[model samples]
Target: VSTAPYGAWQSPIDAALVASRSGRPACVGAVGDEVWWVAPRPAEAGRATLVRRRADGAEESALPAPWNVRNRVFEYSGFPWAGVPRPAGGPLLVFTHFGDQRLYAFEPDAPGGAVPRPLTPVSAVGGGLRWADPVLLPERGEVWCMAEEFTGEGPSDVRRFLAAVPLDGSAAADRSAVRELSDDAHRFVTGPRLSPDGRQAVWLAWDHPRMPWEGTELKTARVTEDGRFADTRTLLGGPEEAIAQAEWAPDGSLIVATDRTGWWNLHRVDPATGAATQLCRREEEFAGPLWTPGMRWFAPLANGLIAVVHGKGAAVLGILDPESGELVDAAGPWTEWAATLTVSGTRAVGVAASPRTAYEVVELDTVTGRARTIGARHTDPVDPAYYPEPQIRTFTAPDGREIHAHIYPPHSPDFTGPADELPPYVVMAHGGPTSRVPAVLDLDVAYFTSRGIGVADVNYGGSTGYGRAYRERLRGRWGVVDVEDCAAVATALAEEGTADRARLAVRGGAAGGWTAASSLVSTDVYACGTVLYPVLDLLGWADGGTHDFESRYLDFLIGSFEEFPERYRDRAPLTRADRVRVPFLLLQGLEDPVCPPEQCDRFLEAVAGCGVPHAYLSFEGEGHGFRRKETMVRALEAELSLYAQVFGVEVAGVPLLKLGE
Candidate 1:
């Protein structure tokens, strides 16, 4: 019921529970003249259901999916309604879940209709294989998907393959005989592409230890007339080249977004030639690899041209000609419709926001760069007290390196501070020393500012959106540099007297948690410290309780557990727990696989030994990242209370602690 935001958003819905009003918004999907998504229902009624909406905005529940589905964590993406034409019937929508990660067929009908049927099935079930868009082999009546079937369990979920499912599901009954085109443990295949002729399929893969950004291989293979793969070999991809989100040009050329020149841009890769020509070279990011839940960059279009809605702050939509290595006139921020530019035919459609508005879906012409507001109804009518224009601020590190950050103070509730007073600052370090804090309206940040707490989101070194080199700033220098930059940011605020030095607090979680703790011991700037599942023992992190994906991440964030054991011990905050005199708060998820609960327990034990006044709150069912409504709500309430308690900032009316648990 609380509607406060710097960005207006469409309610995301689940794919399976489209018909149920009780579905969580995160499971939804946008499609043709209508929006088809998932939602959950009343407590006893149905857990999840699918729903839909018409072009005119009429909404309705669609149909029922299996309720007995185990671990139904469904994911829906690539609703290719108009992008690629379907075979005289209707477009195919692909969805994935715990029990069965397969494709489903949604028939075209009057908006909000009956439930769709499964196109592919149990063949995709076993093994933790998830699903995305299938590379359609129209001529052969086939499609391919990517999945990493759990080989055994634990670290065994490592092998992946390119599974080819027949477009006509009639042949799918022979699940035992279904085709697995390629099965190479060395290659992690994703985003498959079938040439127009259907004789060849082009795909990309990256080996172990190297996430997609580090290195990837572009591969092409001949497909038998029956749609089976053959003669597979590398097309283009390697150490100097990191390719992603590839699109086949109308002329049969491969145009992709890549980081070969140390900058991400569009490139035309020639398989037969093993040569790559840069398309639009720029320092800014053209595409972002989808690793987490919210990370995404739209698929490119035909015309040797694609549009990118660059990262954070201001966005630009431009077309790149990979062949000529050129970028053409772009459209943006200028047109009313331009702001909501979602990548479609000749126009880009997306949600546009201004100081006056949150996010309004606007249509912008690609050629003219003019925008038109598509919908007039305001989902989240502007509320001035809760919304304020964000200001970008940069603080110089001790080494003179500029660090980007954003500051938001309680906006014009009309109170002027004392003659000699400044606001209290909440210095926030984002997790993923590799992640960047956007200038856009973030609900998490707003959660604090609305309560009169000044907040700063620092895009310290190792953050993305700038360039790869800037991100490597913490490669071998994880704890040292990240901590220094964070302290420098806090010191910068204190020295400028923009915030009360005695009231300033430093906070972060995951990697950010480590940074916050490091800052407290490495420097004397922060008055209070707050960490959420912060890494206290890198040694334990390397030993166990890690997913296959992040097991080796410490090698980059910190040094290798085996190669530099001393650094792991040296940089860990728990080792120097006594050095932290500032009061602190730590939140840990009992089931976090990334940073185990034992780490939190040990750190809390150390903090207790040092006689530091700190409160440790652990919640069960929460994972590496916090989820579950009650858990998050409680965490937010506790965070504010923790801050208030540590700084003596009284928040009236709300009980600072829960009565008897």
Candidate 2:
């Protein structure tokens, strides 16, 4: 191995290659024998297209250009399309358009049916009409979905309900054509699922001031004749018990995943009595945070077996037989499975990724116990030798609490840091402060690790995948726990002589960005920080500064506004900007509704003449997260330049960040 100074080593994984080489596959499902998924085409200006693999091994795009299969419902979106097998023509797919958020129906296999027809009417209110997690009811001639309608320009004036749109295109031009399937008693609701006998329907619901993962109700109601629900009642879940997912089993029983016992576990709920029988109980989480509408952590199969994705920090695919109580897991290198699963006959399909592979569609034949990839095949952009082999570690914080993290030491086929020199390390805090960083192969992480910069992805307290008690550790202690946990990981690495103590840096986006900024202000561990569309001012975030879904989220993450208003200000980095002496970089998106640029602007103004080195870069047409290839490329290059300048390392091919000293 050729030795060189840290952060100055030459590597093949550049910003462009890292940005253009991979696609994020989501919303995986099965249409007859074919597996379909939505994959990003960053080269096509960040359009999300529907792709499929036929039963005969043929792979192709399901939709033509300009037909992006996406939805912005609640701004976080969910499964965008639902497929129904057709007897007369090709299979029909109902999808949501990203631009209009209108549900459209299209037949990909039809010769002249490639064009999509809108199924729902357009609205003139804020964000127009948005739909997600569609399910087709062929017998009723309608499509069931979650409808997010805005009554006014304000975000909080929006309403989400389980609604039905006529499949015969009656609602295409008339908003009155759609029928409300259930009463809008709750603030938000998911798509309805019909029972085997078609007598009952079930769905998930939650109100504001509490997120879906925090607590949700599983509502069951009798299906009436006029596309309406009757005798509706919450069968499972309450204010403290979080129910992540629910589905109808083949035996006409409901299988639900609820966290009543401090862990998300499988249980069978009787529709008639509302009695729940625990199927699988463990400390590991079988369900995760419900950031989107149609996330599936477990699916009931036809043979009385349940396909589940469960773990702590990492995930694996397991098949549980309800009769024998036998749980058998598939053996593979995959450590993470996407929360989207579909079953067709005896086969189960899901999206999974490992340390050596990006997310790909995988299928399991329950009869044969065989698993194979069906879509989004992983192709290495660079040699596998350049990939960083990660190790799952548990480091103890100063308070003696265990902090989990994935440590990726620098690895490159062409270059390595000198033996006597400790490489600089970057601590990564994942987004969704409620979510955990999966142990998957991410080229973005490899982009730095391959260049001699070590990476530690901390799964701090309050991250999902663990049990409820572990995640609740950050409740009302967001900044304190997240910041200390991240600092503990960095300090542990430096004390272990694995990283340079004086060159430690931190980076994250969204909620992670908040933790990174708070770490810089609250502690002296990091030399610099990178904040991407972060929540700087807790006061603004606690008010009407964000979207409807998360407008009152701080009430649970922090304390209630009525109880602890001062705590929000004290924990916010914007209030403590004067304490920051380290150089940092701020990257924001002009159109971000979640973490608006206003907080970032105020933060910059607060530190204007403090003599702290910093640079601010904003992108147009981007939201809470940067998705476009050009934007990602520019952001990655700028981040590298910031580290190079801060660590006093000479690098090439990227413009230097102009710091305001």
Candidate 3:
């Protein structure tokens, strides 16, 4: 093999190719004999469309461009469509349109033309109206969905409840035509899961200062004769109990996943007596944090069994027999399963991936004990030899605490780093401080690894897929443990002779970006870092600086601003900007509501004359995350250019970044 510098190795997986595969399939379900899902199109300017897989294994798009099937509730979004098999022909569908944030009904198998008709009205307010986690009720001639309505111009004026929109066109132009299905005694809501008899409904609810993971209630209500709700009641959850999700079983009982035992495990609850019994008690998590509005980790099969996704650090798909308390997992090459799962009869379909494969739709036959890929199949875009071989490692912090990380060593089919030199490594942190990065094939990681740059994905404390105790490790210590755990992983790699100590860089986005920036200020391990749309100042975040969904999120991630004002100031990256002395790259989105551009602007202003090379790049019309293909390409190339410049490597196709010194 040809010998070259670590960051200068040549490879065919370019930035554009990485951007091409940015979107993946989600919100999977079954309509009759066909399975359907929402697929993202980054090339189409980040529009997600509806797609269906036929009984013959043929895939077809169900919606056109400019018609996005998405939601804006909580901004993190969730499943925006609901489907049912129609006796007339195909499936009847109800979905939320992204442009207007209005609910719409579509007929893919209609006679004249395939056009969607609006079911909700538009309003001139803060966010107008938004819908998510829809449940179609054709028998009742209504669709019950979680509705987010903005009453005033302030972001905090939004109200969420379960509402019923008419199947006919009555509510199309009239706002009062819609009927409320549940009371909004709580601040947030999800689902209105109807019973098999259609007499009762259940959903999850939570209030402010408490995130869904920290606490939420399982609310129940009785259905009225006019398709509305009455006599709403709280069933099993409270202020201290966090219920991730709940579904009505075939026997009219409730199957819930709650963190009562410090782990999100499955439980069976009686609606009448409010008694709950643990189905399977283990250290693994059966559900996760409700970042997405309608995240579902388990679905009940027709045979009284439940198909679930559960694990410690990495999740897997399993079939849990509630009667025998026996949980049997499907064996596969996959390591992580998405939160979305649906069952048709005894077959469960979900999205799963392994280290060597991208996320693909997989079907599990509970009766036959078979699992296979059915849609969105993964085929090697480039030669498989260019992929990096990763190792799942557990490192010990200075205080003897365990930190989980995935280490990807530099690899190339045709080239290798000089025998005497250690390869440079980039430590990566995931977006959600509460979410864990799966061992999936991400082309963005491959783009760097293929070019002989090692990468370490640190699952620092406060990550899910582990139990609640591990997840709450970041509670009241957001900026502290995250930075320390990331530094522990990065510095440990250098001590083991796997990575060059002087060439190590750190990179993260969203909450992960907070960790990366804090690492540079709090430690001297990394040479450079890439921070993207991060929360830099706790003082600003607690002052109504972010959107309404996370207005009081700091109360959990960190101590109350009233109780510990000095801690908030001392731990923030904005307050510690003067301590940063390394060359770094910063990326932000102008339209971001979660992490506003003001934080980046102020942090850069504070570090202006530190005499370190810093490059700041921001994209217009983008939100908290980089969704558009063109934006991702520029961001990727800019980050690579920063690395090449700081580490003294000659990388092709990178326009040398202009840095402020």
Candidate 4:
């Protein structure tokens, strides 16, 4: 066994600073002022506090108590934070508040200061929640928004609805006029966007079991004589194209990001008719998991130019000519970084990384092609014992397809061993079968490497970044090809003499966990495994009662559970549990709706029956991933112990689980 030390990890990306208080210290329209383009702070310590930079370039914090820190409140972006200039001058900042999700407006009087006041309330239609931006009917002086209300009670039996509210600033802040646009709220209407001329509202909606990303109807409704919704119509997102996040242009053009290109890219939607046109001619990924808020799109500028942050690990903040479909200016190739930038009017922000810098937020000046840091990106320092630079490697699968991966070898100046000494390989399968493992430096990889372990992150088939073909590579071959890739990566390392042939293990969570469990049963390369919230039983996921949004994903991932029972049985790791010879580590979250705790419980019960050496860990507060600091540290420590015990290696200062002494 090998020996190394554990260390903390940090990201190279910086926090995005939106609009500045003073236009001088901050360049006009330059991304040095606004916290996150619209808000000052994107993530806060205890609450969503607004962070602002002083004229002296010092970052400070401020919060409007009435607007934040509420009980049982749900907050997310994708909604709007508009600051439209008032007719008399100055600007009015508007955002949706959750206690009814109504429009709230703020006005900064002195260049960079302002107070917010509630402009509308949801009590009109029994006070429900609403999604999307409120179109200010400036001509008639009104606003339109979607409100969600419950038809039943409690967590298990709740109902959602969408409606439009008009604000003339004539009624008190406690009340407003709300009108139900559609008779049915069961996905009949959604994601409402107002046209530039204020003549129409556009949205995307779908029925009972469909998520926003799966088969939604694109619709447009006209504004009636009295500024009300009229003449509503609908279009298609492929009987299952998964259309969402639609927008309207200043020149009255409609645009949306859809997976219709077989990949998510900007597409033009007909504003008047709701018909969509493919704006992109090439096949390249423009976005990934809509995990958070304050999200901006491919902002279109003058001269057929567009600005956006594209690709991973060194995302380019570029000025692209829409007519020519080429970049005129660009910034970045660094790892672990995110850019909150707008060229002309386009906006971009997300996390990116590199080997030296893990995750840092950067703002790119599209005009000058300059990148600047926003805040302390990632603070964790590298541990001396484990500090190996990542090496890009490739190996061929059984079918002769080339698979890409990133390898982190053991590090530690204190080690006394031969230069050719090999270490056990931990084959990692990333979650989001659609997401790719970034080349950014990771503390999790370091946790093991610092402990004299070796790790390889595989960009298995069906992963993103390379192209559409690479991404769809796992479409129907989900478990089969993905699991095969994991084992193949491990075996390749061993064959290279860099990995210990005697002890190879596999680990992954969610969809990836499913891959690990299947690898242990179907492949001989991995001697042990770790599965976190694994999707072992595909059939159970399909027919088994589920939470909203994921009811039909089974049809896409594996197959319709009812029609393909045998396929589920063949792919499920639990069905062949008794045939497995390797030890394993199982982890789950009680609140995980995607991969329920029952999945882990069933797997553990079978593992007990097989008498395999394994340990089970379940975090009560965590849903899918660890959000608490204690849980994060504990999870890492336990995984390390499991590895040490399985490999028969001992670390002087590290914790290890001794099994069946």
Candidate 5:
């Protein structure tokens, strides 16, 4: 008896519900049977707060208000915290605060009132100083971490090296208290991992013009008499090969995941001879894009076994035996596991999610082969019927290659669309053109679907998790391939009667936004688009306009800017703003350094008068991505309003967004 039109269904999964559950819990690990993680605080303007769970199963915030525990090592930052079990007190913790980018030391269980105190000096330079992915050196009274120092005012006037900072508060006031553990031979570096016996150390490094995924080198060093690293040399990887992660096993050998065989496969390395032996050679990826430093796809357990997260597309938590090369995956319903993997004894702790569940801290016991959520447990606030059923699907690209996508149909327990009407669909492109969109439970996707709108999360040709060949397809065709692949999926869905052909739209952020904006100007498949923190001008981005971390990323994605300057202009969406006659909702973070506000201002200037029902909204305190609950709620509502207006749906309760401003 209840039949509502698509995009007009009255549902409880609204923007407020999505915004309220916008917490992204990550950096999961266990410290002496107590779990620790960095929980995203949307109510606190999107700060990442450090949290700890006692053995009694009681969870609480470790860091107090206004103390954001995050660092900007690669602009995207690494896990910004490290914990050391206490001999007498609770635990010694070191973290970098996002507001000041200063390393702070704290002992929460100290007898006196103990709060985080600075362990490093503050810089007055361009980006000042930042640290991430730390290793505690309690005996030496130092912390080893990747230190990024800015010397000049320019964004690219920066250098990174593995550094050791004193924990006695000497470095808090004096910069000389910090020691450079490794030379600045590499532009980027990960924190050092000392051997179990403390005789050797290993780390990963890469230079500019080569993103971590494209190429990286494994560097090894020996511990000297003074406890400093010495006799450093390249162990593996080069300009052609990429080493995603490297660590020292308890047996003194090295464990690494290198993309030497077109797939990121696990390997065992002999530090003496610099030899690598393949563990598993299946087409599945044992590693993935190194978007942030300190990422671990696998961790060696104390019992000589290894725990891994691997799959062809969506990943799983598995335990691997290096001697037999046999992998036993955890039996769970989760389809996607986060990049942060940590091992304690025979247990592996990670973040995992599935179509029916939100991301939660999960522990996989290798001994029992059981995985269960221990913290940040997912308890459905609304009825389970409100969540959409996403189908993990594959489509054909123009080159007959396999293009992956997760298609979610419009569904509402209270209403169904008219019998003869087809639903409007939105192509949800993920950022990191190097990243893939998994079929996980994201309430933001549900916010639209529960209102009768279909969502297509596309994993284009350049998306990771499909091996190097699939990821390299957009090497020289960044705009062309990403744009076309998204259009192919959208068009195929419309033609197959899954969506209305004239009511399709594209929504994406960062690199994903680049593809959406590019597709809008290059193809007629989408009627509108929602661009969030996008790169509109390749020429500007390649010429030190953005952050130094991605200053030379164009060299890997597109051709070198010095040799292909003309191509940069031809493919830039800013240069073709006149071609975008359709409606679009542009969202920009005013403080974004990845894709600065100047890029958005330039694009708006170009399309000012040529707009067709377009709107541009900018948030003041936001940067790179939206962190505030207000910002998320507003963006979601505005996006839904745009879709309703364009697709002729009578959505209620949501305030209409003003256009042509």
Candidate 6:
């Protein structure tokens, strides 16, 4: 075996190959005897393609780009499409267009038919009229969904409601043909969930200042004969309780997962009385934060069984019996399950992955007790020995609270770092602050670990997966708690002699980026940091600077603009640019609507003459997340170059990021 200095060893996993790799399938749907899912095509400029696996074992693309099936309803879209089997013919689908915010209907197997026809009318205001999380109501001749109608260019000028568009394409040319089902009771709403009896409809809703992750209400309404909803009232959920998901069982009973006992657990709610009865209560989370529409943490089966994704630190699929409170877990090598589930009779389907494998579509037969992969096979890009075996660790913060993290030390089959020198470590904070960093195989993390760079994926306060109490730790302490938790892990790793103390670095994107930037400004623990699409200026984020969905999210994360105005300014990273000392790298997307490029520009302007060594990189046509192959390749290489330069490690093949004087 050959030996070399850390960060200088050659590796088989290149950034380009990693960038070109397909990601996990999402928005899974059970169409008759077939299963359909949306898969990522990074090579197609990051477009999502719909793929279907028939019962006959035929698998192919159902809808290919430049069809571009996506939604921008909340600017961080989810479940942008829905489909059902047409009684007379093939599968019919309704999907939201990313560019025009219009819904289109298409039939994949119709004879001599391949074009998609528009179903929803377009608006002239900002972002147009957006739609997501659609549910087909063939009996009503409509498609129900969450519609975000923009009045003007202002963020708060938009109105979100549960609306229905005619499936006959009548609304495609006339905006007046759309039907507004419910009264505007909430600022945001998910797609409607119709009861099995078709007499009642239920959905999730929340207002500004309280993201769905913070709090939400499950509203139920009576369906009238004229295709309108009446007597809509909240069934279960309030300001204190965060309901992740709600669905109707085949028996016509309502099932919901609410965070009332500090844990997201299963509860059966009485539709008539609005009372909730707890079924499965545990310290482990049965559900997760609702960042997008149609995020199903659990699915109710026909035989009175609920298929749930539940675990602590990691997630697993379990079959829950509501009557006996008995939960049977599916044993497998997978450690993490995506928040998408579809059930057909006694069988269930979900997307799952493990530390040693990439994500693949998995199916579970409840009766047979067998789980196997059916689509999107995961192939090893490199040898198994090169992958880092992560250790699930719990570190103690200064406040004595437990900080969860997945630690991956450098590992290479060809070489190892010097016995006398510890490897440089990078502390990674996950986005969503409400989102947990699953212990799955991420080639991006492996990209560095194989090159002798250690990585710690910190699950700080407010991160989901533990419980509600743990997630609430960041309330009114967003920057403080997140930054402290990350710092605690980095310092503890160095103290344990597992990482080099002198060359520690912190990196994150979006909310994670905010934490990393806040860490660099508030502490001297790291030599440098990498910030991507971060909320650098809280004041701007709280104002009309961001999307309508999260415009007032700071009101809960930090404080109300009316009550605690200065806290927002004080905690913002750009506000304390003069106090930042470490060199940093800032990466941003030119078209990011959530954490827009304007905030990054303002941050650089704020620190114009601070003289801190820093570099800024921005990409066009990329949004909140980098999806294009070229963008991912450049971002990974630039990050490596930044670390190599800051830690004084000799790494070749990539140009070094030039820091400003």
How does each model score on TM-score?
A: 0.81, 0.98, 0.98, 0.77, 0.98, 0.98
Q: State the lDDT of candidate 4 residue by residue for 406-434, as single tens digits.
A: 88876655553345556877889998676
RMSD of 6: 1.3
Choose 1 or 5, whichever is better by TM-score.
Answer: 5
Please say which candidate is ahead in TM-score: 1 or 2: 2
Which parts of model 6 have CA positions greater than 4 angstroms off?
A: none
- Give the Å error, residue 486, model 5: 0.6
Model 2 lDDT tens row, 1-661: 7878888878888888888866567888888887888888877777788887788999888877677788887788877999977787878888887877788988877887587888888888876788998888888998998888888888778878889999889999998989988877898888888998888999999997898878999998999776689989988788788999999998898999999988899999888887899897788788888888899888888888899888766878888887787877776666788888888888888889988988888887788888888777788887888899999999988778889999999888888777788999999998889989887788988988888899999999999888998888888888888998999999999999999999999999999999999998999999999999999999988778899888988887788999998898998999999889999999999999899999999999999899999999999988878878899899988998999999888789788888885
**TM-score, structure 1 vs. true:** 0.81
TM-score of 4: 0.77
lDDT (Cα, tens digit) per residue for candidate 1, span 1-661: 3322211111221111212211222222345444444444433232344555556767665445453111211122322111124545444444443235455545545256434455554533333544554545455555666645555565435566777666567534555444688866553566467665556677777665666666677777887866677888887878546675666655677766777777666666775776877666677776654342212243355444565555433345555544555555444333111211234556545544443343444455556767665532234322555654577887877668888877787543433444565667788888866666556544556556655567877888888767678777887798887877766777787788777787788899988998998888777787787788888887777665565556666777777766788888888788887788877777888867667888888876776656566677788866665544555555666666666776666654234743110
Better of 2 and 4 by TM-score: 2
Error of 6 at 631 (Å): 0.8
In model 2, pairs of residues that clash are none
Query: Who is ahead in TM-score, 1 or 6?
Result: 6
Compute the lDDT of residue 523 as modeled in candidate 1: 77
133 in model 6: Cα distance from truth in Å? Answer: 1.3
The per-model lDDT (C-alpha) reads: 0.59, 0.87, 0.88, 0.57, 0.88, 0.87
Q: Arrange candidates by lDDT, descending.
A: 3, 5, 6, 2, 1, 4
For all candidates, the clash counts are 36, 0, 0, 35, 0, 0
Candidate 3 lDDT, tens digit per residue, 378-451? 99889978888878889988888889999889888989899899988999988878889887788898899999
